[PDB]
Design a protein around this ligand. Structure first.
Ligand SMILES: N=C(N)c1ccc2ccccc2c1
Length: 246
């Protein structure tokens, strides 16, 4: 997350930290995630497409820091790693960038909801917030594009939704961004999501209810002028989410 503010997991209890076990024993951070049900975590396929081995991944809930065992956190293994069959990645654009992770503890149990571990409500069909609506993003991703390390403490920021017609402008992304994708950025281009925030939530408060409107997918650089953050429009993938979680 470029700019914004440092936060703890109590402000984002649906946020899931996904790590990977390397051959040798080393563990590194991969992507962010969102708990939609006690057994399921939703993320992006581009986070796992090159390493589709479910045994390699570790999922944390109620974790506030990258290398700290936060009080009340829960560690999980991936029982089932479901990737979207029609996933593809162009020069910039990532298509069907949605993945489901069935989480399981070593005792074979799903997430136990608490103060720091909660689910995020899925949006309703054809009911997304209008352009200009302020939405929040969370992640352990880069603070600056030039950084190679990720921040230790969890970060959050507020970005405004950009219409499809505005994001399809030549100086923006042109025809590369589709109706299945949602654009969101800072009008002053100072704050944005970045490398490492991928798979993370884009939560919008619509009609008094907090909902998982987007999933961090792609973007040209980080916090660049006329280059918004592109998010997987969750509302479109509702029949896919329902069928693969049944
Ligand atoms: N401009 C962004 N918000 C953005 C989002 C996701 C990314 C993933 C990998 C590298 C850069 C990214 C930038």
């Amino acid at each position: 997350i470029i700019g914004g503010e440092f936060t703890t997991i109590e402000n984002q209890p649906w946020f899931a930290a996904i790590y990977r076990r390397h051959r040798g024993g080393s563990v590194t951070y991969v992507c962010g995630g969102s708990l939609i049900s006690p057994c399921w975590v939703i993320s992006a396929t581009h986070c796992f497409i090159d390493y589709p081995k479910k045994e390699d991944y570790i999922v944390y809930l109620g974790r506030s820091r990258l290398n700290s065992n936060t009080q009340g956190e829960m560690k999980f293994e991936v029982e089932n790693l479901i990737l979207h069959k029609d996933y593809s990645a162009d020069t910039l654009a990532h298509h069907n960038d949605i993945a489901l992770l069935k989480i399981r503890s070593k005792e074979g149990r799903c997430a136990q909801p608490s103060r720091t571990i909660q689910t995020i409500a899925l949006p309703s069909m054809y009911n997304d917030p209008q352009f200009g609506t302020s939405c929040e993003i969370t992640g352990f991703g880069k603070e600056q594009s030039t950084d190679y390390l990720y921040p230790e403490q969890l970060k959050m920021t507020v970005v405004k939704l950009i219409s499809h017609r505005e994001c399809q402008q030549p100086h923006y992304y042109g025809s590369e961004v589709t109706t299945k994708m949602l654009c969101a950025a800072d009008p002053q281009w100072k704050t944005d999501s970045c490398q490492g925030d991928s798979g993370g939530p884009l939560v919008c408060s619509l009609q008094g209810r907090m909902t998982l409107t987007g999933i961090v997918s792609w973007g040209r650089g980080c916090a660049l002028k006329d280059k918004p953050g592109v998010y997987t429009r969750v509302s479109h993938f509702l029949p896919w989410i329902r069928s693969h979680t049944k």
